[PDB]
Amino acid sequence: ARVQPVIVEPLAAGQGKAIKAIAGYSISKWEASSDAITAKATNAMSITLPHELSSEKNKELKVGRVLLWLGLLPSVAGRIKACVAEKQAQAEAAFQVALAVADSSKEVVAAMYTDAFRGATLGDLLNLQIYLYASEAVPAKAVVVHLEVEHVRPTFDDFFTPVYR
Amino acid sequence: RVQPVIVEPLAAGQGKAIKAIAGYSISKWEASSDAITAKATNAMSITLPHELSSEKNKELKVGRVLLWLGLLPSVAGRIKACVAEKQAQAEAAFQVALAVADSSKEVVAAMYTDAFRGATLGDLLNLQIYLYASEAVPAKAVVVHLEVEHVRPTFDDFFTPVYR
Amino acid sequence: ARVQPVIVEPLAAGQGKAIKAIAGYSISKWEASSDAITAKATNAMSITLPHELSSEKNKELKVGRVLLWLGLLPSVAGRIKACVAEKQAQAEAAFQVALAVADSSKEVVAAMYTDAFRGATLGDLLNLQIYLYASEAVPAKAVVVHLEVEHVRPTFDDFFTPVYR
Amino acid sequence: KAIKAIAGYSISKWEASSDAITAKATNAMSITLPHELSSEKNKELKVGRVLLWLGLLPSVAGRIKACVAEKQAQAEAAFQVALAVADSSKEVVAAMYTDAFRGATLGDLLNLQIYLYASEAVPAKAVVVHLEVEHVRPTFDDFFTPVYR
Amino acid sequence: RVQPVIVEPLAAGQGKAIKAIAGYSISKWEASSDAITAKATNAMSITLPHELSSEKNKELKVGRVLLWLGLLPSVAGRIKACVAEKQAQAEAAFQVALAVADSSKEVVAAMYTDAFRGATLGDLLNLQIYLYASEAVPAKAVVVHLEVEHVRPTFDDFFTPVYR
Amino acid sequence: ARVQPVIVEPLAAGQGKAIKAIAGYSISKWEASSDAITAKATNAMSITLPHELSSEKNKELKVGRVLLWLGLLPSVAGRIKACVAEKQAQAEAAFQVALAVADSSKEVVAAMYTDAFRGATLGDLLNLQIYLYASEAVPAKAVVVHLEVEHVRPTFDDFFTPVYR
């Protein structure tokens, strides 16, 4: 005999529960500037490590969630899709095998790849690619990609480089 | 088992207010704009108020912030705006940006629940807002407001000492 | 481990919790017929008191909520916006400083100005204006505006005019 | 100390403008209600006490008088069945029908008529009746109309 | 029997502050002047601030008030100022006046502990201050301040509702 | 029915309760030699930091009271006023907006700016000026100004400069 009536708050952008990561982990933050693409063409673009993460310690840690949210040039126009995937030698087909995929057309331009990699070594993402694809041609450096990732906190980025003492 | 409900449509302006977290204040002000043509992105400096710009309060610890902008009702098309540090490239700011204020969306407000917490008002001095527009806009047709808050200056206290 | 599944009743128009005002107050009801407007132009239109409310008692009461819901000529066409505001000398800009604003385009053609005036004297609304604006030209007397307001109940509209006895 | 209305009752007032008026002729007219309460929601409310009293533009010679009555045929005679009668000549011009309507729906107010009788012609708008009917508080007239107009 | 003491000289500005009576605020502002010649008495309207002039707060109940004026340091001679309703005669206001602010006296401040209590800000709109001067004064050489206070507007609350 | 009769000690100069600062703070002491001024003219004169206080640690501490007591050349003659204020671009008007102001004419040639700055960063006083004004022309270096200030004690001016060991 329930009939509880709810009100629904419109939600201001940026409002949100934010989701901080499970303990012992530390989300890092870094970028990957886009290249200009031919219209409807789908270029691959490789995933370099951040400077600090190229260190030979951390290349074998353990990675959990991956969150690729795609920013844009504000006045870019067309539909745009992007996703992480295995190093395929070809085109779209990474999308047809991708676990998840971002879209410009739907409110949240983001994708979260939980379970996709937990828990790989951090260094092995070098084998991976992101993929980018757009309905329309776009100018270069206009689709920056903020993929984000966490790992067990670099336990021994604790101290100064010893030299000297 | 199923628990049927009934959505109540909700009119503009009647939503629950967000109280400031305790011990704070609010400090609204305006920041009128100019021009913006085609798909250019004009940038505006923020500008501190009357009572504010004083060395007493230039240190205060900013908390959350809000930035809703109000269009002239009859402006054509779609516009967006954001807050970020003086990027050398005007478009670039949106890319690092945490939130925009899309006009197409049902509600034109962005707020940064974090991002500015623990910050000096003085740092907020050099912190451009931006605009983008798909069309043409007659000058000062658009005027960003902004709630901010900061721990209350003792300011109120009692009066200035009578023996000035 | 929750996953409570809800049903959503479609809601018939006019259904609703209605919201009666906090005690001691009494909502009044009155009108303000619209004037014909030039297309895209934004005329001001002044707020007269209702006959009974012009009485010199009530002009100093205390006003709480204000609810301006905008009715229409059923076959009026274009986008229409309306809002109460300070007596600006100019045009749209009252909208860019208005706390709230009605729209034809969104289900609820209404706006509720709680906190906007609580608690002014009832008489001081004379300083205020509503504003009206439309994407398209409209015929006169086609956009009647039912702004509604409450106040402490007129404590001494209790009795007959004494004359005589 | 005026005679305040009992309990939950709520007085509500309105003037009714007059008309042209010739000497000796009884001049009929009809009460026609505030629009606000003329609704079907509340025409069916229970009336209690009612009284009319009528001001005059000061420069009107001669006596004038009025009353509320049922619709008539010869009209003029209605004073003879009138249960009270306001008059300029009288001490207080007010007339009070405490009893006569105390039980009525406002539905019958619609077919009641007020009458005017100047002795000699008086210019239009020089007389203005005011009614002071009284009735129960509307149940609806408290909570807002639902948002979804 | 005698209870010897020892007066402590007290430096400018170090006196005990007067707290506002509880639940209030403070609302300082300026009111710059002009001219004043010979022994004429120029009159100035008070002028309500930025945030103030809004129908929400035009009713608020004013409490006490303070009015200290600051001379340009090097002005000649002696000047006085007061607050009263628009007397038809400019000199006359001092005569009904409750307090002046003499310059010759050690401390140049007048305050009206009562007199305005229970008053609307709106009434305060029509309420001239005055000046008098024994000499000549270059324009805007003198600038009355004024503490006032009024019950706090809820104003702070939380933010404007996000759905503007 | 009180009528307690008091005696009043004349007070020798220098006698006084002295006022030491609230704990954790440490008053510092430093100077600012005056420049010659045109009669009745009011020059600004900037506030440099003391040598030790220019250190990049302390420039962000917390400042409480400020006490500007003005010494003089003993045989200087005229009326003299001085005050700290905001960096105005003009003349006297800093006095008409100054919270407090010293005077030669009244026993205590001093001013204490409690509440004026509590609690700014120590470094931000660089934006401030003192102002000086005199009824009569005065010779240079004749109106030295001993403004004094305290701050949280420089917590880590504790140790020797490490070099070496």
Taking the C-alpha atoms of D96, D99, D104 and D106 in order, what is their torsion angle to the nearest 10 degrees? 10
Q: How distant is the Cα of E164 from the closest Cα of chain C, in angstroms?
A: 5
The angle subtended at Cα D89 by Cα D84 and Cα D93, nearest 5°, is: 55
User: C145 and C43 in contact (C-beta within 8 Å)?
Assistant: no
Pairing assessment for the beta strands A63-70 and A110-112 based on DSSP bridges: antiparallel
Element holding C132 (H helix, E strand): strand C129-134
User: D70 and D24 in contact (C-beta within 8 Å)?
Assistant: no
Tokens 């430093």 found at: F30
Helix segments in chain B, DSSP class H: 93-96, 121-125
Question: What are the residues whose beta carbons fall under 8 Å from the beta carbon of E163, sequence distance 6 or more?
Answer: A10, B12, B13, B15, B107, B109
User: B104 and B57 in contact (C-beta within 8 Å)?
Assistant: no
Element holding F97 (H helix, E strand): helix F93-97
Distances (CA, A) of B71 to A53, B79, C42, D1: 45, 9, 14, 56
Q: Using the 8-state DSSP alphabet, how is residue C151 labeled?
A: E
Cis amide bond preceding A164, omega within 30: yes
Q: Which two tokens stand for residue C16?
A: 């609703």
Which among D86, D55, D56 is positioned nearest to D68, based on CA atoms?
D86
DSSP state string for C10-25: ---TT-S---BPPTTE
Going B97 to B99 to B100 to B102, the CA torsion angle's sign is positive
| Distance, CA of A110 to CA of A102 (rounded, Å) | 5
The one-letter amino acid at E141: A
CA E101 to chain centre: 10
Q: Which two tokens stand for residue D8?
A: 């939950």
Three-state DSSP string of chain D = CCCECCCCEEECCEEEECCCCCCCCCEEEECCCCCCCCCCCCCCCEEEEEEEEEEECCCCCCCEEEEEEECCCCCHHHHHCCCCCEECCCCCCCEEECCCCCCCEHHHHHHEEEEEEECCCCCCCCEEEEEEEEEECCCCCCECCCCCC
| Distance, CA of F28 to CA of A61 (rounded, Å) | 52
Task: Tell me the Cα Rg of chain D.
Answer: 17
- Interchain contact A/D (3 or more Cβ pairs less than 8 Å): no
Which residues does chain B have within 8 Å of residue A73's beta carbon, measured at their own beta carbons? 91, 94-95
| Distance, CA of C113 to CA of C136 (rounded, Å) | 26
Q: Note whether D92 contacts C21, CB cutoff 8 Å.
A: no
Taking the C-alpha atoms of C69, C72, C77 and C80 in order, what is their torsion angle to the nearest 10 degrees? -30
CA E2 to chain centre: 42
Cis amide bond preceding A71, omega within 30: no
Question: What are the residues whose beta carbons fall under 8 Å from the beta carbon of A133, sequence distance 6 or more?
Answer: A37, A40, A41, A42, A80, A81, A82, A92, A95
Q: Could you tell me if D148 lies within 8 Å of chain B, comparing CB atoms?
A: yes
Per-position b or e across E35-67, b if 16+ CB within 10 A of its CB: ebeeeebbeeebebeebbeebbbbbbebbbbbb
Residue F18: left if φ>0, alpha if ψ -120 to 50, beta else—which one?
Answer: left
Q: How many CB atoms lie within 10 A of CB A99?
A: 13
User: F71 and F63 in contact (C-beta within 8 Å)?
Assistant: no
> Across the beta sheet with C44-46, what order do the strands follow?
C44-46, C129-134, C80-85, C102-103
User: A92 and A133 in contact (C-beta within 8 Å)?
Assistant: yes
Which among C91, C76, C75, C89 is positioned nearest to C132, based on CA atoms?
C91
Chain B: residue whose CA lies nearest to E111: B162
| Distance, CA of F79 to CA of B75 (rounded, Å) | 63
Q: Note whether E161 contacts B17, CB cutoff 8 Å.
A: yes
- The method of structure determination was cryo-EM
Residue E37: left if φ>0, alpha if ψ -120 to 50, beta else—which one?
Answer: beta
Chain C: residue whose CA lies nearest to E54: C86
Which among A47, A72, A57, A67 is positioned nearest to A114, based on CA atoms?
A67
Residue from the list C19, C158, C161 with its beta carbon closest to the beta carbon of D144? C19
| Distance, CA of D2 to CA of D13 (rounded, Å) | 16
Q: Using the 8-state DSSP alphabet, how is residue F125 labeled?
A: G
Which residues does chain F have within 8 Å of residue E13's beta carbon, measured at their own beta carbons? 99-100, 111-114
DSSP state string for B41-52: --EE-----TTT
| Distance, CA of D7 to CA of C68 (rounded, Å) | 32
Residue from the list E6, E11, E106 with its beta carbon closest to the beta carbon of F112? E11
Helix segments in B54-130, DSSP class H: 93-96, 121-125
Chain E: residue whose CA lies nearest to C96: E164
Backbone angles phi, psi at B124, to 5 degrees: -75, -15
Resolution to 1 decimal place, in Å: 3.8
Q: Using the 8-state DSSP alphabet, how is residue F24 labeled?
A: T
The angle subtended at Cα F163 by Cα F160 and Cα F165, nearest 5°, is: 85
Cis amide bond preceding F131, omega within 30: no
Residue from the list B3, B13, B30 with its beta carbon closest to the beta carbon of C112? B13
Task: Tell me the Cα Rg of chain B.
Answer: 19
| Distance, CA of C104 to CA of C14 (rounded, Å) | 17
Which among B129, B37, B134, B139 is positioned nearest to B87, based on CA atoms?
B129
Distances (CA, A) of A7 to B11, C49, D86: 11, 34, 57
Going D115 to D118 to D124 to D127, the CA torsion angle's sign is negative
| Distance, CA of D95 to CA of D115 (rounded, Å) | 13
Q: Is C153 helix (H, G, I), strand (E, B) or coil?
A: coil
| Distance, CA of D5 to CA of C159 (rounded, Å) | 6
Backbone angles phi, psi at A146, to 5 degrees: -100, 60
Cis amide bond preceding D107, omega within 30: no
Q: Which two tokens stand for residue E1?
A: 């029997």
Q: Is F82 helix (H, G, I), strand (E, B) or coil?
A: strand
Instruction: Give the neighbours of chain C: at least 3 Cβ pairs within 8 Å.
Output: B, D, E
| Distance, CA of F162 to CA of F141 (rounded, Å) | 39
Three-state DSSP string of chain A = CCCCCCECCCCCECCCCCCCCCCCEEECCCCCCCCCECCCCCCEEECCCCHHHHCCCHHHCCEEEEEEEECCCCCCCCCEEEEEECCCCCCCHHHHHCCCCEECCCCCCEEECCCCCCCECHHHHHHCEEEEEECCCECCCCCCEEEEEEEECCCCCCCCCCCCC
Which among B141, B128, B143, B131 is positioned nearest to B39, based on CA atoms?
B131
User: D127 and D88 in contact (C-beta within 8 Å)?
Assistant: no
User: C80 and C34 in contact (C-beta within 8 Å)?
Assistant: no
CATH of the domain at F8: 2.60.120.220
Tokens 């509500």 found at: D12
User: B36 and B42 in contact (C-beta within 8 Å)?
Assistant: yes
Q: Using the 8-state DSSP alphabet, how is residue C117 labeled?
A: S
Cis amide bond preceding F164, omega within 30: yes
Q: How many CB atoms lie within 10 A of CB C8?
A: 10
Preferred mutation among B14, B65, B82, B95 to probe A, highest tally of A CBs within 10 A: B95
| DSSP percent split of chain C into helix, strand, coil, nearest 5 | 10, 25, 60
User: F63 and F147 in contact (C-beta within 8 Å)?
Assistant: no
Residue F19: left if φ>0, alpha if ψ -120 to 50, beta else—which one?
Answer: left
Q: Using the 8-state DSSP alphabet, how is residue C120 labeled?
A: B
| Distance, CA of C90 to CA of C94 (rounded, Å) | 8
Q: Which two tokens stand for residue C52?
A: 């009974």
| Distance, CA of C91 to CA of C98 (rounded, Å) | 12
| Distance, CA of C23 to CA of C151 (rounded, Å) | 10
| Distance, CA of F82 to CA of E156 (rounded, Å) | 38
- Partners of B71 in the beta sheet? B142
| Distance, CA of E63 to CA of E60 (rounded, Å) | 9
Cα end-to-end span (Å), chain F: 74
User: C53 and C147 in contact (C-beta within 8 Å)?
Assistant: no
F104 HSE (CA, 13 A, CB side): 19
User: B77 and B85 in contact (C-beta within 8 Å)?
Assistant: no
**Portion 6-25 of A in contact with E at CB < 8 A:** 10, 12
Go through chain B and tell me how many residues it has: 164
Three-state DSSP string of E20-79 = CCCCCCCCCCEEECCCCCCCCCCEECCCCCCCCCCCCCCCCEEEEEEEEEEECCCCCCCE
Which residues form the domain of F14? 1-165
- Partners of F15 in the beta sheet? none
Taking the C-alpha atoms of C93, C94, C95 and C98 in order, what is their torsion angle to the nearest 10 degrees? 140
User: B157 and E13 in contact (C-beta within 8 Å)?
Assistant: no
Cα end-to-end span (Å), chain D: 43
| Distance, CA of E126 to CA of C70 (rounded, Å) | 37
Which among F140, F115, F52, F44 is positioned nearest to F84, based on CA atoms?
F44
Q: Which two tokens stand for residue F16?
A: 């006084």
| Distance, CA of C99 to CA of B12 (rounded, Å) | 10
Q: Note whether B73 contacts C93, CB cutoff 8 Å.
A: no
- Write the burial class of residue C10 (CB in 10 Å: 0-12 exposed, 13-18 middle, 19+ buried): exposed
Backbone angles phi, psi at E80, to 5 degrees: -140, 155
Total structural domains in chain D?
1
Question: What are the residues whose beta carbons fall under 8 Å from the beta carbon of F61, sequence distance 6 or more?
Answer: F121, F122, F151, F152, F154
Q: Which two tokens stand for residue C37?
A: 């407007």
Cα end-to-end span (Å), chain A: 74
Q: Which two tokens stand for residue E40?
A: 């004429």
- Write the burial class of residue C37 (CB in 10 Å: 0-12 exposed, 13-18 middle, 19+ buried): buried
Q: Using the 8-state DSSP alphabet, how is residue C57 labeled?
A: T
Residue from the list A7, A12, A74 with its beta carbon closest to the beta carbon of B10? A7
> Across the beta sheet with A63-70, what order do the strands follow?
A25-27, A145-152, A63-70, A110-112
| Distance, CA of D101 to CA of C91 (rounded, Å) | 53
Pairing assessment for the beta strands B43-44 and D9-11 based on DSSP bridges: unpaired
Q: Which two tokens stand for residue B46?
A: 């923020």
